[PDB]
Ligand binder design. Structure first.
Ligand SMILES: CCCCCCCCCCCC(=O)OC[C@H](COP(=O)(O)OCC[N+](C)(C)C)OC(=O)CCCCCCCCCCC
Ligand SMILES: CCCCCCCCCCCC(=O)OC[C@H](COP(=O)(O)OCC[N+](C)(C)C)OC(=O)CCCCCCCCCCC
Ligand SMILES: CCCCCCCCCCCC(=O)OC[C@H](COP(=O)(O)OCC[N+](C)(C)C)OC(=O)CCCCCCCCCCC
Lengths: 61, 171
């Protein structure tokens, strides 16, 4: 007879995850490119503005 | 014109002007007071300075000796401007060039003291600070509001004096 063994549950265990869980994350790539061009263009705005000011300062000195 | 390298040793000369040329008293201002009052030296002494350099151009190569009489007058007129600015605006002229000896003698970092100095000198010594070669449709740099290039730390005496000139209505 069988007494005292390890046995499974009366209804079994519930299912574990064996599929690939690799959900596609992030924005669209053109969103990242548009954000990249916006950041870089704003930086060029400030940089070229500062170069023109520094030129006017050089005129003063 | 070229600078000395490779073990230059300095030497000076125990001598005097000859009797031919009269005495001229010198400029005793250093770089921060000279850079401070540079535009007012240039505003008052424009035809004297230009006659001196026009002398130097006209009689080429003689140079030194044939232009001494106007090199006299440019030094004397600049000395006149500096004692004029001392006896009227000593405390804020001093405020200006004490700002200027910090911040690498950059005029970009001393705007709130130079506004005070320009207002004093313009109402009392009646000389105006101007940048020539600047056509209209172009703002002068020391007039603009919110410049891109602000200094690291504004000097404390000049921001205190600037705020007190705001509340007096001076400026
Ligand atoms: C220090 C300066 C360098 C900063 C790093 C560079 C800028 C960030 C650009 C990439 C991130 C981004 O903004 O991406 C934004 C995207 C949004 O995707 P979603 O809409 O949720 O996708 C939905 C897809 N579903 C349906 C499957 C869910 O991803 C994320 O939110 C993921 C978290 C990003 C955390 C940012 C990492 C830094 C952690 C510290 C928080 C500041
Ligand atoms: C210390 C802070 C550490 C930050 C670590 C970085 C966190 C990254 C988060 C995941 C990124 C992601 O998920 O971007 C996902 C997208 C790709 O989406 P897709 O595969 O084409 O799906 C398409 C279908 N959708 C969209 C509906 C799901 O990527 C890109 O096109 C460009 C991502 C580049 C981000 C580079 C940021 C730094 C740039 C510096 C210049
Ligand atoms: C080859 C790529 C060409 C891209 C053309 C984009 C058109 C944008 C026009 C906006 C004009 C403007 O707003 O400019 C204003 C700014 C600041 O000028 P300010 O000092 O305030 O003007 C003072 C005029 N005064 C002196 C008369 C008073 O000046 C600029 O330089 C920045 C231009 C915006 C960013 C340009 C990004 C270029 C990045 C290229 C890297 C590939």
């Amino acid at each position: 007879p069988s007494v005292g063994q390890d046995l499974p549950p009366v209804g079994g265990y519930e299912p574990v995850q064996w599929r690939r869980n690799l959900p596609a994350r992030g924005f669209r790539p053109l969103v990242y490119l548009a954000a990249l061009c916006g950041i870089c263009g704003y930086g060029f705005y400030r940089a070229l503005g500062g170069i023109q000011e520094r030129r006017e300062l050089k005129r003063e000195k | 014109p070229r600078e000395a390298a490779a073990h230059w040793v300095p030497f000076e000369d125990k001598a005097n002007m000859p009797d031919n040329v009269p005495d001229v008293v010198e400029v005793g201002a250093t770089s921060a007071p000279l850079l401070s009052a540079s535009y007012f030296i240039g505003a008052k002494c424009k035809p004297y300075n230009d006659d001196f350099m026009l002398c130097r151009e006209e009689s080429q190569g003689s140079g030194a000796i044939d232009c001494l009489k106007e090199g006299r007058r440019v030094t004397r007129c600049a000395v006149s401007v500096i004692e004029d600015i001392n006896k009227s605006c000593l405390d804020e002229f001093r405020l200006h060039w004490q700002c200027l000896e910090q911040n690498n003698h950059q005029l970009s970092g001393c705007r709130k003291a130079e506004a005070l100095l320009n207002k004093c000198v313009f109402t009392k010594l009646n000389l105006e600070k101007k940048i020539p070669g600047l056509r209209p449709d172009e703002e002068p740099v020391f007039l603009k509001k919110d410049p891109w290039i602000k200094p690291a730390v504004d000097d404390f005496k000049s921001v205190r004096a600037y705020a007190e000139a705001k509340k007096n209505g001076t400026l």
